[PDB]
Amino acid sequence: FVNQHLCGSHLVEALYLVCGERGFFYTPKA
Amino acid sequence: FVNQHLCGSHLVEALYLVCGERGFFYTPKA
Amino acid sequence: GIVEQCCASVCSLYQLENYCN
Amino acid sequence: GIVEQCCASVCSLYQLENYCN
């Protein structure tokens, strides 16, 4: 599900699913 | 929409909506 | 932490914005 | 950045995991 264009809340959801317990950081200007 | 129990993907979505361009960091073990 | 403050307990805009960049 | 690598272009698992903690 990861090898596509992932924009906006879709990208954030993918990070959530992939990173799991670790959590993640979302920075759209860097 | 922010003054409730926000768990899992719901919490991540709220951070996305509230933080906007700034982005955010999601750390569920700290 | 964000889960204890916003999932296990009721969230707030103050709490959420502490995690914006 | 994550938007240029995964929204403007096709994402990858390698790219995504670079943003896990």
Token code pair at residue A13 = 């959801």
The answer to whether A15 and D20 have CB atoms below 8 angstroms apart is: yes
Question: What is the C-alpha separation between A23 and A1, in angstroms, rounded?
Answer: 18
Determine, for residues A26 and B29 on separate chains, whether the beta-carbon distance falls below 8 Å: no
CA diameter of chain D: 23
Q: Which residues contact D8 (CB under 8 A, 6 or more apart)?
A: A5
Q: C-alpha distances in angstroms, D16 versus A23, B2, B19, B23, D19?
A: 12, 27, 20, 15, 6
User: Which residues on chain D are in Cβ contact (under 8 Å) with A2?
Assistant: 11-13, 16
The single-letter code of the amino acid at A7 is C
How determined?
A: X-ray
Q: C-alpha distances in angstroms, A19 versus A13, A28, C14, C21?
A: 10, 17, 25, 19
Question: What is the C-alpha separation between C15 and C12, in angstroms, rounded?
Answer: 5
Q: How many domains does chain B have?
A: 1
Alpha-carbon gap: A25 to the closest alpha carbon of chain B (Å): 4
Residue B12 carries which DSSP code? H
The domain of A8 spans: 1-30
Sign of CA dihedral C7, C11, C13, C16: negative
Distance from chain centroid for Cα B8:
9
